[PDB]
């Protein structure tokens, strides 16, 4: 495997990432009688087991399958949300969110603005599996966040662990803006840790510094956080370099202030993501940090990303911005 998963709110119990999603969903339906969950295949628990037992607990009118039509799922979701009911839609793989692109970008994101706040779909959240999975190839691997980041009016949120997932998903569900929640599917069974049983929230648009450091700032999100955490340990051991490791968490609106504050301290920045380099969200972080931190930057900002290709099947080990690719770029940046 290319990563290793590692690491106050009442009683907790061991949950993997898919279980933490179920727990968020369950807490949500318990609290909010309007809330419904729907998608292609959610009734009997879903492909990744994220909705197991919810239909039996809450009823077939609240946890139900739609026809196989992503554009419809999102339009339908918008519609529910227009009435003020909580609509939690699932798109089975992030790769299949594109048929819904018009409903998300032209409709959901602009609903409140274009009406003068006479109507909104703030109570919509779209959750979807995301990211590489070892053998997903072109259409079961994709990381579409950069496409959505260029759309004012939506939020895009990506967690790194079961604890982070449940808190961030609850915040999306309760946030008064349409939210896309991308669940890193490679962690569904892999990452396991103590998760509060009862509801809690983690704030949106707030990065998390998971490790303080002084020579360089490392930024990623989802699974890639675990990669840069390892890269930090590699850098300490092999180079004597102290790395500050940051999980962005919310892609838009993003926490410009946390990232810039870190870079003022360290003077160097490397951003990593699985998505292709060109047009990827690392460009927006790099360009912003450069504007705000120009007098502190001792070296060019590094982007260690996927190549500008579709996501391959057999070649995945060579495609992904793994710990060695990140480490080598970090080394070169430190030597600058």
């Amino acid at each position: 495997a290319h990563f290793t998963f590692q690491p106050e709110y009442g009683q907790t119990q061991k949950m993997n990432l898919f279980q933490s999603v179920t727990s968020a969903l369950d807490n949500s339906l318990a609290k909010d009688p309007t809330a419904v969950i729907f998608g292609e295949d959610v009734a009997f628990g879903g492909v990744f087991r994220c909705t197991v037992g919810l239909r039996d607990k809450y009823g077939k009118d609240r946890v139900f399958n739609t026809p196989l039509c992503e554009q419809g799922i999102v339009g339908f979701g918008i519609g529910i949300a227009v009435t003020g009911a909580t609509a939690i839609a699932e798109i089975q793989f992030a790769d299949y969110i594109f048929p819904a692109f018009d409903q998300i970008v032209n409709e959901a994101a602009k609903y409140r603005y274009r009406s003068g706040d006479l109507f909104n779909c703030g109570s919509l959240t779209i959750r979807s599996p995301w990211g590489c999975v070892g053998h997903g190839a072109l259409y079961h691997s994709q990381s579409p966040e950069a496409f959505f980041a260029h759309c004012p009016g939506i939020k895009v949120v990506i967690p790194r662990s079961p604890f982070q997932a449940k808190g961030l998903l609850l915040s999306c569900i309760e946030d008064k803006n349409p939210c896309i929640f991308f669940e890193p599917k490679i962690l569904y069974r892999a990452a396991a840790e103590e998760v509060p049983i009862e509801p809690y929230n983690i704030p949106l648009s707030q990065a998390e510094v998971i490790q303080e450091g002084s020579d360089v700032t490392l930024v990623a999100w989802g699974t890639q956080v675990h990669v840069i955490r390892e890269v930090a340990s590699m850098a300490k051991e092999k180079l004597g370099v102290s790395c500050e490791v940051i999980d962005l968490r919310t892609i838009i609106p993003w926490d410009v202030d946390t990232i810039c504050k870190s870079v003022i301290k360290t003077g160097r920045l490397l951003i990593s993501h699985e998505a292709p380099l060109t047009g990827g969200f690392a460009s927006e972080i790099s360009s912003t940090v450069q504007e705000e931190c120009f007098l502190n930057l001792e070296a060019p900002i590094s982007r260690v990303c996927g190549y500008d290709t579709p996501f391959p099947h057999i070649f995945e080990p060579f495609y992904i911005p793994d710990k060695w690719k990140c480490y080598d770029a970090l080394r070169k940046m430190i030597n600058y």
């Binding site: 139900f64 739609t66 039509c69 554009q71 227009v82 274009r114 003068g116």
Partner: protein
Amino acid sequence: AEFIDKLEFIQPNVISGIPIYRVMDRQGQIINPSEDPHLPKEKVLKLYKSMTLLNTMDRILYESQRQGRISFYMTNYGEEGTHVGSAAALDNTDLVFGQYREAGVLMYRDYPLELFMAQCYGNISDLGKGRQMPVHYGCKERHFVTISSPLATQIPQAVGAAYAAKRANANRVVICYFGEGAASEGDAHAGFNFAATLECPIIFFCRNNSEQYRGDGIAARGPGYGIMSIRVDGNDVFAVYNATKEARRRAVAENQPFLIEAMTYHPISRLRHYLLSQGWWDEEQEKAWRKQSRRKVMEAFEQAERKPKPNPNLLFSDVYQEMPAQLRKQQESLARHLQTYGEHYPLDHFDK
């Protein structure tokens, strides 16, 4: 079903040319008394006055557009009957979704002339804050969801709203208006199918006024989705009313969708002939009403033109409910810019 032992392709001939439901002929006479809705005088006059007030507004705003006083306009000519007729069959709180030809629904619901005008002018009275193109109307108070330019996107949204209404145990319907063109979009297929499989109390109201479809119009698609369907004469307000009224009653009771396809291309003429036959109108009333309507519209028009546009700060609000700190930074950047460069911008035409 059963087996068949000879090979036979099903032709598009299956049931028929779907016939067009009519109540009133072109001389305003009821064709079959069993189908007369016997609507009261005051509501029939309200149908007539709504249609003609819309037509007066259309004349004036169309000319305003030709002069460049507003940037864009879409008239309602020939659709006045479908919209008033159907609107009259709804409950006040039934939620409406539409596109560009639905202003008559608003007009029937007593949307003020001042607010039609405010939206078209993007002025300070516009509750849409001047942000959309003209005729992209919306009214929360009158349960008329804000129109958006992309065709057919409202169709699956209307279905979601209807599913939510079913759950809320509402005695509420949703109506969703669209044209035959919009019915070609994928979102139309989504809406129709979702409404049927999810059992939603929704009326799909398709305006049909060769390159768009090859079957028998849009009504012939309904059965294939398991949707109860009818075709009506869109120049006949009573045919429209009757079909909408029965669709609404069944949709709400049975949680099932209905499709009405209204054939259009005059509705106003036909309704006027009806009024005369009852002794409910005459030439003096027609003359006084044309004068009063024109005065009402011109007063709204002149007022709307003279209002300032909204504060340019409204450019930034409602993007999200709250305003992200980075968006506020952009708003602050604009304000600093206008302090230095304001003489190059039309500040005097905008509020504050």
